[PDB]
Symmetry: C4
Subunit: 386 residues, 4 copies
């Protein structure tokens, strides 16, 4: 029939009734439209902003609703909810960018959700060795356990040097019981700290099933297995394995290193990429080892005695090591080793970009989170000052 | 003469008649302008959005039409078509960004075109081994053929180890007919699966000409060539080639690996880059091999006996392998090897960025496509719930 | 006193006279403002767009003029010029982005300036061997000269292989005059082609001073120097240099390779980066060679006989070659070689990102230029069809 | 009760009194609102821009204030201050981007603060050797000291070559006092230049504590220590250390090289990243050396005599050097070396992206600063020409 004016605050909008009444489910398609009617002015006064109302009216005109890139999603979805609209009908070309903006905002939302849980006898000491700067004695425990881990690692390394603990002489007086005593002490502090952590843990199951607890137990257990086995003499064999397993104490530094935890998280995130790396690596290794073995099988004194023996050459060449203990001597072997070097470079460089990008993005998340916390504290102080 | 008002819904626009009538081909330059004339108000009421109409009026003023970056191209070209305008007259400085936006949208358009073709006796089994999760027995076939490929590869590798199938003794009782039996079995399942795929293929030509079919046939054929040739005795020579060709069975994993297909696609896309890599690599190799041969020709017992013999040194040095079996002994040879290492590093690193970028963009396309499918399903469910 | 309305087409603007008259140099601060005055409406009707006029009025209010990022610079500076404003007074925070947009547009401007010069007896043949697809016989010359370059390179490589041109026997009948004849032929075609290019060159100075002409002459001249020197017997010495210089014929492929020209351009652009690479490389080499020599000087039979002799070890280690012909034997030497490997990796990786970025940006310029040409042709055809 | 109109210049805005009076602290919530009241028009005329006033009114409606991305922050915070608002209440989703824009602008602010301090007997000569292009004799001093550094480095390198300064003969007449004289001269110019710099330095403490002064003193002092020690005979020992320390004179080129200073700054900025690199590197080295030693301990004549002896193999393998003087001979050793190569590649490549990004961003800062200075000079000249 005619056109009605439905002005937003300040800027006026006018449209035909039939277009406005196409969708009766929304606020503007129902009796709420008649509710906003004003006397002697016939203007539907909405106390909102006109920019989003432009898109709302555009959605009313066509069957398509868009999303302006240069706008705040909070205001956008506030105007959507206020006008009885849903975020699931905003086209498809604009829908993906809207989802990207929503996920970027939700990242901050769950960051604040993790922040606000900051906050009783026993668990107090659990709060001690959970943030090293909460107290002074907790920091003392932190530094003491770090020093003990370091001294244990250093002693384990030094135990094998000649004239330090292994004699190079024949009949002269150089072992040390002091190394055993130092190992006993280090294991004592390690197990005491682990037992205190287990006792102070609010949830025994969550603590025990955690990666750090299993790392601690696999670091401390070898000493106990060794003392148990000493009842069955000191025969070699598994003794070498027990000696090897003592290097796992260096993994306890992940409490003292944020970078170690970031690297663990970025290795967890790229599990598919590392799996593809391993699969393509072993596929290329098998192919090139087979080709190299069959090319170098019939030499004078070739070290390519089998495909498993060619695995060594293939892995040395693909990583661009080039020890030189196994080199091809035939034309075909040389050609295929030349191809193998470049192909291994390509295989290795395939997922390194993804690993780098994930590590960089996690690192940037860490700095963005700490910067957000600091700036939020500063803003709270500034707004409290006024 | 005067100015006429041609207001879009809400916001008014006014302009002189002569400017509006410069182009009679469009909607607003013809009798359609008089059609929209309203009585007692002399306002041309267009039920569109004002933002794009601003650019339309700007095009009417000058001979130049721009494109706003902060807008939806669907709305933009809808307003262009509605007002009798063409997308081929939107300047040149804004034209390229418009084309970029159009191609980004068209990417989603053909993605939906590939999605909507999801969807009868024989071809049903073809649908079995085309998406492994469609049925339960199809997944059984998938895992069975994967296991058989793996066991064939493992047997081919193990066949060459001493004391496994090759005797290291002289007169003691170690070959195995069991290896031949396992090869017969693996080829049996491989050819049965390939024959079933060929029979169930809707188009025999498209299936046979495909890369996967030719890979399967070149993997299975060597056994048949070998059995045919056994009628002509078991003389060596091509027997080594037949043994080598058996490693191609590992290429059948590209059905089981999305990463292998992505790598194949990104190698296809970068064909020019790989060609340039090969050309620059061989050019540098020829140059440096010539220089190194002429610098190291007159040593005591130099292994630089010819330029082809210096190809080996050049390719080892350019890839930073450094076996050490061929090292320069003269000052000129050392200088040119030092230059050769860095130059080869540069040559290799020239197209690796492009290969990395293409692989990353294809990978991102894969995740964006699967995310779009999942979010479209979720949006359909949500809109069905209301 | 009061406020005057100075409405742009459609949207109205009102401001006080004193603010509008602050700058009399501009169009709106002078009698042109009174020129636009309309009767019985007191509205200064400007037939422009309101968005840029908002920034113009903002500049009139304060002493600061901004630049909207979401706008076309062509429209922006058109409104600046139309209103008597200059682009040199648009603040400083917005000035840099304005300059970036202007340079991005000017890049297309000079691209079109290079395009529009596409376009007589002699110079016609110069147009033959300047774009290979202009004619059919020019393409024949292109392929013929490419084949001759390739055969010359292949002959130069093969001339040094034993039993091909160098006898490995003692008294049996294997030199070849055919190699000399092939060299004569290749030099004949090379010099004929170069002479034709020089004759057909519109500017002899520009052609001769060009890099391609000097490459061609240094490739062809060694044969003439050799024939001249043959009058002074065939004594060795410079004969090796003449043989070496024959490999420069492979540089003529830069006509046939766009990638070679792109690499040359990106090496020219990064001259400062390559200079810094060389400087830091030689600095690190000197430092580490001195340290390694003084650490390894007093070994049993060390090959570290001098700092120049340690240059070889340092350059081998810094590039991660590791030949193994020179390895440190002392603790200090091992520590400093371990540091040297990582430091050389860092030094090499310092400017590789810049070289990669420059090569990628030049490559992207090439594709963007060809895409722009193709899309401009398509747009011209489409606009001619209507 | 009713709605009041509070129009900004041109575009009108209307709102209810209760919403406008929610916050009395601001300009519009106090008697300043009544101050702007106009007679016979009841319009609050604000001579500002409407775009930011839209966000101001939106903040008045809700309890949330947003920030438009497509706007100048100078105008934004000018409108915030003019209307009695604070930048600390602009939400949180828009707050972070606002802070990013503020820091980007402040970067230019402190760049201009460092620029404007450009600007008396003694200190004049200090201005001589602080910017080499200020005068002509200062440039002469710059080139003279560069030449003397270069000749000192060259002499130090050449002093160790056989037959140059070290005799290879037995009884024939080849040392040189000329090398000592050249060293005396170089130290003379070095100490004269350093003394002049110290005398002309406005602040002796700031100059002495600087890195360049300590570099100069550690470069010049070894000669004086040597002349002092010559009174205690010429016994070896520390003589080698004094000879080694003479290579530090090459560090004086950082005055002559902007890239050296940029590299120093980017190493200072990435101190945490280099610390993490060192920590992860030594952790991996310890782990892999322990495993390799225990795997290769029981070979025939293995060089894996201890974990410290396996440090050499681990660091050679992790950097992909591969000298080949120590190679594993057992299956376990080969497997763990194969893992070690890839793991070392990962460890090395972890912080190289961050180092590259920091160096690139510092380099881009340098070019952006010099470009800004040049364009500011050009703009000043252009505005002076009008
Ligand atoms: Zn859209
Ligand atoms: Zn434009
Ligand atoms: Zn600005
Ligand atoms: Zn917001």
């Amino acid at each position: 029939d005619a056109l009605i004016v439905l002005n937003v605050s300040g800027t006026r909008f006018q449209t035909w009734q039939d277009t406005l009444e196409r969708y009766p489910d929304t606020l503007l398609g129902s009796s709420e439209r008649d509710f906003f009617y004003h006397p002697e002015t016939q203007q539907y006064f909405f106390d909102r902003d006109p920019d989003i109302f432009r898109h709302i009216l555009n959605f009313y005109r066509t069957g398509k609703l868009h999303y302006p890139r240069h706008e705040c999603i909070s205001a956008y979805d506030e105007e959507l909810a206020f006008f009885g609209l849903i975020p699931e009908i905003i086209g498809d070309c604009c829908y993906e960018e809207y989802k990207d903006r929503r996920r970027e905002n939700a990242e901050r939302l769950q960051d604040d959700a993790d922040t606000d849980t900051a906050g009783t006898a026993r668990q107090r000491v659990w709060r001690a060795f959970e943030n090293p700067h909460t107290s002074t004695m907790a920091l003392v425990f932190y530094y003491v356990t770090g020093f003990f881990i370091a001294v244990s690692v250093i002693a384990n390394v030094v135990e094998t040097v000649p004239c330090g603990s292994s004699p190079g002489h024949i009949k002269e007086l150089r072992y040390a019981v002091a190394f055993f005593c130092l190992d006993t002490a280090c294991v004592m502090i390690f197990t005491v700290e682990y037992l205190l952590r287990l006792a102070a843990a609010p949830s025994r199951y969550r603590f025990v099933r955690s990666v750090m607890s299993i790392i601690d137990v696999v670091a401390i257990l070898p000493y106990y297995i060794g003392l148990v086995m000493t009842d069955n003499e000191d025969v070699s064999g598994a003794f070498v394995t027990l000696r090897v397993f003592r290097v796992f104490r260096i993994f306890k530094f992940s409490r003292h290193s944020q970078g170690l935890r970031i690297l663990g998280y970025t290795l967890k995130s790229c599990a598919s990429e590392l799996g593809f790396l391993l699969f393509s690596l072993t596929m290329a290794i098998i192919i090139f080892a087979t080709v190299m073995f069959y090319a170098e099988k019939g030499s004078s004194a070739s070290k390519f005695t089998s495909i498993p023996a060619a695995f060594w050459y293939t892995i040395v060449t693909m990583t661009t090591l080039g020890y030189g203990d196994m080199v091809p001597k035939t034309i075909a072997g040389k050609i295929f080793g030349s191809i193998c070097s470049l192909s291994g470079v390509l295989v290795i460089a395939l997922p390194v970009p993804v690993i780098v990008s994930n590590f960089s993005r996690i690192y940037h998340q860490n700095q963005r989170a700490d910067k957000r916390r600091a700036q939020k504290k500063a803003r709270l102080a500034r707004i409290r000052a006024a």
